[PDB]
Amino acid sequence: STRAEVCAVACAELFRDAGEIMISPMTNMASVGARLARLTFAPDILLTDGEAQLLADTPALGKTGAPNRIEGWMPFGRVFETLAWGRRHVVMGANQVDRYGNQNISAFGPLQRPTRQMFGVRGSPGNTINHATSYWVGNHCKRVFVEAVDVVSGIGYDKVDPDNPAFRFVNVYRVVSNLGVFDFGGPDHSMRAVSLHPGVTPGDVRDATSFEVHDLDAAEQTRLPTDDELHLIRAVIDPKSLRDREIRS
Amino acid sequence: STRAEVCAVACAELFRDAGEIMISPMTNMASVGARLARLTFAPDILLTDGEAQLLADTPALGKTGAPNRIEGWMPFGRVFETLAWGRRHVVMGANQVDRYGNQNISAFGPLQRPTRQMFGVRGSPGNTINHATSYWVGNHCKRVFVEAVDVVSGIGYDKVDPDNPAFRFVNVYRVVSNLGVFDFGGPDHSMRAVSLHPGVTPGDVRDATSFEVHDLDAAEQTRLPTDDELHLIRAVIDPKSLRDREIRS
């Protein structure tokens, strides 16, 4: 198996024990993972067609030709209703992620005069205050994994006010990168190594991260895709290998 | 012209200069008035089919046979949205109406142990705090026109807190009865006589109302239906004469 395949399975594992909730994979790598989960160990998840309908089956990523069977309607209004209700797990990209799990997809630099403009905060604030949120990063480097983000789009554990029960649904879960799986179980919910992908040393992660990752030297190897997982990824879910464009070098 | 026809035209005049808002006539008499208005001097009003669609034309009340042409959808959710937005005039019945325009369709007697149960407050509180509200009373008597209602379902002018801008949309407009047209332009917005129907003396109203009606002796005669109005009422809008069952004795 390749690095991309190990990553796809790591993304799939984000949804183990998800139950019957909406999974919203906002990258191709997360979307391969989500479809793998639906076909295997998380069969009850809901998935949209990338627009406004709920898919009945689990077709190949990016595919054209035969129309998809649907099981429901999920326009953007209903996504907002669903997310505030809490029955969702979103996997987003991230231009920056910091050690308490704050995410930036908004801009670089000062708020009223950025040095580079991206999308704005989008739904990141609503997502991170309401339900399970995870991140996919395809090029784990110091410019992504920073001490503190320029703009807080997705909130991290340091922003939780323990005296305000409005923060009680925060659940920033994991970061899956081209190097490893990470969580926020370190001290003060600082970033901690769950696992390192085969071929990745602690030194690789250390040289690619602007802060120290907790338990990095003790981190086991990320599990290999099984033969059945490889079959589903290669032949059923991602036959065009869109997963390979998600990671670099 | 008959008393019922004079009442129907008085109900129609409720909607003069209404503009392009939803009229919600909740009695047959108000509904004859509303259809008369739409076909003549208030052509821009919206009217439902009595359930969940907006009518494109203005058919006869109580008509059967061919389905109505529609111009929109108005389910109950959208009625709530419309009323909070303010673009509406409702004409309701009333078990009791008091001198400041409070209405009761809820119950008689104490709140937690009534002596007679009706519907509860329904939408009266929302209607009266949000937009133009008028009342149709087909048997003007002391037990309807009371000093003070048992249960405040529709709010009256005495409930307005002038220091709270949340009351700024209150617009309890008129009461049309089998005897006269009334408004709330008296002192402290107490009930005032606009007009008395042909055949009705001030003494008739005085003997049928539990409080004194302002300017009652000075009240002009309610205007007669025109020939065109009589033609529309008798032949086009209310050919079954449902209007005649609205008023008594």
Added chain:
Amino acid sequence: MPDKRTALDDAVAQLRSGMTIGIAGWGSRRKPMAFVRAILRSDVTDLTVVTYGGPDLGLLCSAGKVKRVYYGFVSLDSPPFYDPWFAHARTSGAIEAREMDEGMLRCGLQAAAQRLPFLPIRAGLGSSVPQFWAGELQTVTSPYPAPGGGYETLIAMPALRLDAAFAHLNLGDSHGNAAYTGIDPYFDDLFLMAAERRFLSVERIVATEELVKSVPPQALLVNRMMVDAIVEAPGGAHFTTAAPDYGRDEQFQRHYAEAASTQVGWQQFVHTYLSGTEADYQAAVHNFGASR
């Protein structure tokens, strides 16, 4: 995907005495009447009910199973309009009444669906509604001024959170995807989203592909996240209207209301219609109809 198909009694046996339940539909329209009849067969009692009330609420009151009711109204939608069992419960002092404006009830469900503690609303201000609530209904002041100056004080409508909700729709699949085929969804989605336990009945269970081909996407009101158990209940709204499937059974509803007016008449009604299973009820009802 999960197979959620269950029987009426099996669903109701998840209730416990003292629970807060939501009954969906509106008045005498698309009410989960077969679920209500199953509650009447159980020992569950002391219920707090949240409803746009109709004969659903009347049946529960006739059984003495209601402690408290949160309602926007109670109506049979046809003569004699007022539900006589609700009236009895109210005039006897048997229930605590948490009466509210119709819009307020929806707002309360919306707050529960959004997991918010309250939503602000104008509806209620100046009316008898706060007095029904005995101190429990509070206000909230805006931190932004009105266009005009001054700060508005609004009703703080609390969340109407439910231990369980019951709804009836026209068509669904075995996983709980479901559609309304009538002109109005009412608020069944909000009832389900406000509840911890979600129970849906439908006139007919079909394949997912049949469901989605029979209606426009906008009619797919219910998805799998909104249902814990689904029950096939043909005639399950009787005697309320179920849209294109069947209308209100007007003569039977009047028979219900007339029977409630006397001791002997009610006892006979209970014996004839409410003492067996849902199948016994449906057969008795068809026989009443065949007579007319």
Added chain:
Amino acid sequence: MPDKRTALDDAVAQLRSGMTIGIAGWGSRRKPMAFVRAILRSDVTDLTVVTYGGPDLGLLCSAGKVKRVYYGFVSLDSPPFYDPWFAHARTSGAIEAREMDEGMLRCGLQAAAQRLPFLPIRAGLGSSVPQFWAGELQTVTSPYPAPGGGYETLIAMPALRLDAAFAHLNLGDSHGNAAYTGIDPYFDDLFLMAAERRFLSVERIVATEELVKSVPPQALLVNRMMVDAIVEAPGGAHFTTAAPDYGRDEQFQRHYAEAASTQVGWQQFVHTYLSGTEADYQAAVHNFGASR
């Protein structure tokens, strides 16, 4: 009923400099692009814009007509994703940014539609959003305790009232009844309900009876109370997607973005596409397409 048909320029001449305007649709989806092009032809400037931003906002920024933007995001929905004119405006410090979460923008429109001064929301708490607002965005405390104890403090999302709103739909009548024929209404209804002046464009104006026969009732998003003026604008969403009518013009959108990258390229784009009428634009666009 009133005939509300008008021309693009006639609608835009109701705007005044300094107004707060709402632009409906979403990103590069069903945007009122013909209305935006008409704003570019007028002298109206110093606009405060409320939008789920896309090339609509880019065009306004390219003209230097924007003072302040309230937005949930800005995206072209396809590569290069970021709108280069919005990026220029932001990096140059040309606009005041009132950035917010996507759900917050909807909530803000809902509050304006309900004529409420605020609605409470969790979205925003802990994020950079309050800092974008420079102390304008306040909180509200619940008067009811959370299940667990303690009182929640939430964002008080203020009403996003508008002086005018612009929307584009697929089909309408001459009185302003209108439908969307795609899969998503977005939030066009809220944009209209939040505004004092309501302007709608449609691909085609038909008789009322044709409108209502061509869609399910649930697609009839707009009624006559929600519109002051309607404009027939075939291709009026170009170059954003207008659903079954036509898709996103992907090659043209890329051409737009490339042209924005240089002074000469933009001047040439303005000359070719934006220096005549809407009909001139549509012909130039068809010619670009015919070439490919």
